[PDB]
Design a protein around this ligand. Structure first.
Ligand SMILES: [Ca+2]
Length: 976
DNA sequence: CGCAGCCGTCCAACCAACTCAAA
DNA sequence: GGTGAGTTGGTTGGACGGCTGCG
């Protein structure tokens, strides 16, 4: 081939690592540990009693393939050549081609020029509607950056643009390493343009050199090593972003059409021996050969692989957590389920097994009954053969989407550690590209218990359902079984990691039980994936933000806003510089008068719009605004000690304000269609409106993150300053206008029915970041739910400006304020809401958890306890030491007395009082020694001097000093 | 009877182990 | 990616108060 394929298509030799337990009639002395040594035969697969080599492609293969090429052999049917008109892009790659490298391919001159002598090529990855895999390579996208003309001319004595091209070329030749060679001024194109720096209102338009560069590597050097005295603009912008922004309409995910170019040129199909990727067909084109295909929105037949690995620790402890760098800690099985992402149908069930494995009739009957495919079990003699066969599947079937549970944190890191460290397989050919592609995992950072990681593989969207579900569903435990019982309501089986070595050693039937359990977990995760449809959300954000779905997952929130801002800033002639290097506090207490929550709809975005906040409307200096009129043409605001100014929208409209304005218009338009739309559309529209929400809410954070892409702490500080002043204005208005019931009634004549017995008062009692809680003494809760909408409306007219809206969320009938962001309350509908508090403690026993709930539930649902709890707030805490406790709390005390009785009673259901831990270590002293579970294992409290199981959970219950348990532990301390 | 020394008790801070959470 | 797991429970050290001994 023209570019070498770097994945394995042939293999004669490998490091054979396999458990000695797989050898039949081995004596017990040999039936332990692993073989580890080289073997000189082809890697091999056994399936249903047939054998094939792993890397043999042809008829009879034990797993499906969607690969045209294998090791440069074209396995397409004779004369295969599908016409491509429309195709759906899901991911975009950017790579440097060199005309010299491609000289043996049959490419037209108009492509060769765009890579002469080098150039970035954008590769669109997709399917046709018939399910043919396509790559379209787009030529001609130069990256570019700007520098101020007067600073450049003065700094390095340039007269005309080709001088700057020579200066940059020289700065490449003279690099500290030999990293840039073959350079000329022609690697650059430079032109003079007029632009304005995005920062500050006073800033004049100036002449900049816009410099075009052929490679992101060349750019990254000039934007760090060349004239660092001169500030640079948009040097961090990648070729993908330039491609998406420079062509109106274009998207990183969606349907496209091939079409004639400006000189009636066409896309050129590549020959098979010139393919860059594992695709059925490939094309060269330029961006004028492309258009969006409007009216297509159905996803094509992409394939999803859901996978899960089982591992067995092979060292001195068979029950320790396995470590990939220890050769003897093996991958023993991999379940791999292949779905069609468009129909949601499970198409294949593959189980890779080290050692023979016979799946149970029970399991095979259950799958057949559920209508699912019959599993193919693939058996391997060694761990290398298995990992190579899984990676061979990944390259040959090429699943566009991959999922699993903790696949980023464990399964991929363990596999790729094994493949790179133990075995020495180059991963750069195992993605969509045939070599030199990204295939990498990395650790997030200093996070020691929560080991967390990211992955990028070219052309493969990794979505981990652990990430999706932790980001969505509030749960006590995120173990996959706990999630299956919570989300799918489905009580599936367990096999412990402690059971696995005992099962694995027994024989093929017991290794089958490991298979059943492994398959079943991948099925649960597939069902979770197609419940949440997370690809549709990530797709929606990718389309909206103008970034690929890969960056949508693995990069932060900032790049989303940055890319949108960059498009808009360009339209308006701005350029973005490359970044260098209290009365609201709750008096805690219990309220039995209704509490209305007012809450600002999207406070920070609505402030940004209302007050026209932006980089480009800010000023720090009065002579910037001395020609304008105060209050009319600009806002003045003291923020963090500085006097900031922001010109109002009719002087200059904020770029942030325009982004937010336009997004919220789209969100309305979509949500207006949802009730009319067909149920297939209704889910898509729901994903679109959700994508817009997360992008809007990220604007505030984007400005506030220092050393971010485009920071402006003055805007973030003004947003939060205005937010604080708005909450106090809300409090002052509410207190001043509605001091007396008559004033409320004059504004809302409904209040005549609402009026409850006793004194009327209406006071703010808590104020969050963007909500206010109003204690409505002397009003009934029922009508107050409705009057709150009209109050919130009236406040939003009297105060504030048209993008800002205060809304009535909810009415508590009873509320316990505990602290900032901690409260419990019962809503008017009877539902209890708990915020910032856990009433069940994970380390406590059932007796304590249930009794804790009983006390809180009684405070909220017994009005006698509620009223008496309100009476407590009449006095300081110390005075209730002297005075008798208020009448009505006796029923609350009664639950404590009852629970106390139930400790020291016969017929104590001891099972409610069982604490628990798993011993895990060896059972002797360590440091702290007296760990309860050790003294109910080793120095056993109640019973004989040893306990059978070292790695499972010790149940234990505390008991009285008795001159019997004392003697037991005090003598066991001597036995020791 | 007063003062000094020693012992006991209480409080605060730090360190270690468990938990998921993958096996 | 910047903060460390939270959490608790046990152990050690320091301070304060009370009782006993000595002058
Ligand atoms: Ca997993």
């Amino acid at each position: 081939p023209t570019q070498r394929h770097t994945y394995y298509s042939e293999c004669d030799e490998f490091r054979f690592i396999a458990p000695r337990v797989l050898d039949e009639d081995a004596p017990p002395e040999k039936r332990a540990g692993v073989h580890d040594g080289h073997l000189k035969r082809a890697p091999k697969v056994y399936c249903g009693g047939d054998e094939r080599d792993v890397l043999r492609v042809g008829s009879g293969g034990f797993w499906p393939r969607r690969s045209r090429l294998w090791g440069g052999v074209d396995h397409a049917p004779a004369g295969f050549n599908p016409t491509v008109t429309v195709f759906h892009v899901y991911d975009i790659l950017e790579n440097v081609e060199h005309a010299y490298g491609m000289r043996a391919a049959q490419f037209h001159a108009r492509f060769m020029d765009a890579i002469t002598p080098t150039g970035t090529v954008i590769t669109l990855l997709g399917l046709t509607p018939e399910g043919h895999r396509v790559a379209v390579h787009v030529y001609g996208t130069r990256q570019y950056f700007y520098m101020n003309k007067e600073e450049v001319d003065r700094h390095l004595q340039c007269r005309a643009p080709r001088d700057l091209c020579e200066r940059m070329a020289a700065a490449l030749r003279e690099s500290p390493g030999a990293s840039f060679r073959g350079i000329s001024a022609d690697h650059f194109e430079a032109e003079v343009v007029e632009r304005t720096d995005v920062y500050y209102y006073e800033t004049r338009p100036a002449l900049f050199y816009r410099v075009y560069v052929r490679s992101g590597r060349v750019l990254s050097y000039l934007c760090d090593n060349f004239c660092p005295a001169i500030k640079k603009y948009e040097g961090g912008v990648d070729a993908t972003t330039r491609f998406i922004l420079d062509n109106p309409g274009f998207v990183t995910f969606g349907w496209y059409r091939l079409k004639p170019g400006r000189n009636n040129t066409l896309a050129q199909p590549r020959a098979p021996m010139a393919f860059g990727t594992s695709s059925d067909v490939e094309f060269n084109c330029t961006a004028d050969n492309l258009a969006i295909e409007g009216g297509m929105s159905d996803l094509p037949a992409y394939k999803l692989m859901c996978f899960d690995i089982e591992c067995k620790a092979g060292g001195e402890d068979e029950l320790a957590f396995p470590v990939a760098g220890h050769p003897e800690d093996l991958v023993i099985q991999i379940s791999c389920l292949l779905y069609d992402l468009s129909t949601t149908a499970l198409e294949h069930v593959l189980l890779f097994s080290l050692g023979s494995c016979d799946l149970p009739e029970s399991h095979l009957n259950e799958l057949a009954a559920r209508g699912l495919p019959t599993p193919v079990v693939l058996e391997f003699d060694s761990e290398f053969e298995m990992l190579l066969a899984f990676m061979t599947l990944v390259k040959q079937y090429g699943p566009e989407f991959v999922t699993g549970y903790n696949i980023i944190n464990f399964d991929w890191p363990f596999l790729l550690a094994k493949l790179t460290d133990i075995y020495k397989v180059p991963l750069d050919g195992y993605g969509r590209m045939n070599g030199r592609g990204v295939f990498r995992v990395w650790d997030i950072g200093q996070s020691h218990f929560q080991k967390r990681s990211k992955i990028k593989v070219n052309g493969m969207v990794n979505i981990d359902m652990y990430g999706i579900i932790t980001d969505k569903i509030k749960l006590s435990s995120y173990k996959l079984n706990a999630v299956a019982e919570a989300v799918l309501k489905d009580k599936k089986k367990d096999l412990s990691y402690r059971d696995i070595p005992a099962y694995y050693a027994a024989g093929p039937a017991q290794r089958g039980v490991i298979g059943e359990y492994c398959i079943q977990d991948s099925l649960l995760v597939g069902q979770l994936f197609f419940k949440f449809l997370p690809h549709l959300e990530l797709s929606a954000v990718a389309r909206l933000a103008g970034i690929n779905i890969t960056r949508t997952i693995y990069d932060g929130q900032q790049i989303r806003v940055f890319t949108c801002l960059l498009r808009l800033a360009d339209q308006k002639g701005f350029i973005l510089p490359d970044t260098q290097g209290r009365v609201l506090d709750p008096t805690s207490g219990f309220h039995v008068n209704p509490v209305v929550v007012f809450d600002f709809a999207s406070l920070y975005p609505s402030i940004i719009q209302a007050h026209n906040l932006c980089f480009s409307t800010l000023s720090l200096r009065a002579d910037a605004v001395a020609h304008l009129e105060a209050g009319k043409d600009y806002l003045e605001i003291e923020v963090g000690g500085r006097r900031l100014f922001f010109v109002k929208a009719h002087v200059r409209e904020s770029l942030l304000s325009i982004l937010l304005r336009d997004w919220l218009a789209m969100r309305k338009q979509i949500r207006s269609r949802i009730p009319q739309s067909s149920p297939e559309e209704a889910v898509l529209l729901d994903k679109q409106q959700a994508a817009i929400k997360v992008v809007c809410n990220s604007v505030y954070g984007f400005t506030g993150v220092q050393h971010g892409l485009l920071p402006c702490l003055h805007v973030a500080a003004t947003v939060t300053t205005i937010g604080r002043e708005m909450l106090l204005a809300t409090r002052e208005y509410v207190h001043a206008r509605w001091a007396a019931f008559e004033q409320l009634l004059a504004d809302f004549p409904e209040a005549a029915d609402m009026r409850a017995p006793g004194p009327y008062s209406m006071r703010i009692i808590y104020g969050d970041t963007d909500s206010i809680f109003v204690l409505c003494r002397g009003l009934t809760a029922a009508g107050l739910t409705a009057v709150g909408d009209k109050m919130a409306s009236h406040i939003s007219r009297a105060l504030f400006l048209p993008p800002i809206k205060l809304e009535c969320e909810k009415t508590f009938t009873k509320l316990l304020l505990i602290a900032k962001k901690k409260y419990i309350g019962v809503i008017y509908g009877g539902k209890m809401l708990i915020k910032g508090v856990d009433l069940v403690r994970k380390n406590n026993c059932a007796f304590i958890n249930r009794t804790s709930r009983a006390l809180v539930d009684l405070l909220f649902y017994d009005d006698t306890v509620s009223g008496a709890a309100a009476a407590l707030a009449e006095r300081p805490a110390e005075e209730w030491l002297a005075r008798p406790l208020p009448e009505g709390l006796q029923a609350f005390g009664a639950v404590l007395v009852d629970a106390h009785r139930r400790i020291t009673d016969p017929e104590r259901d001891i099972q409610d009082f069982v604490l628990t831990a798993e011993l895990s270590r060896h059972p002797r002293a360590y440091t702290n020694k007296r760990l309860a579970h050790l003294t109910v294992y080793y120095k056993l409290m109640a019973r004989r001097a040893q306990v059978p199981s070292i790695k499972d959970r010790i149940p234990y219950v505390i008991v009285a000093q008795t001159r019997e348990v004392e003697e037991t532990v005090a003598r066991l301390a001597a036995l020791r």
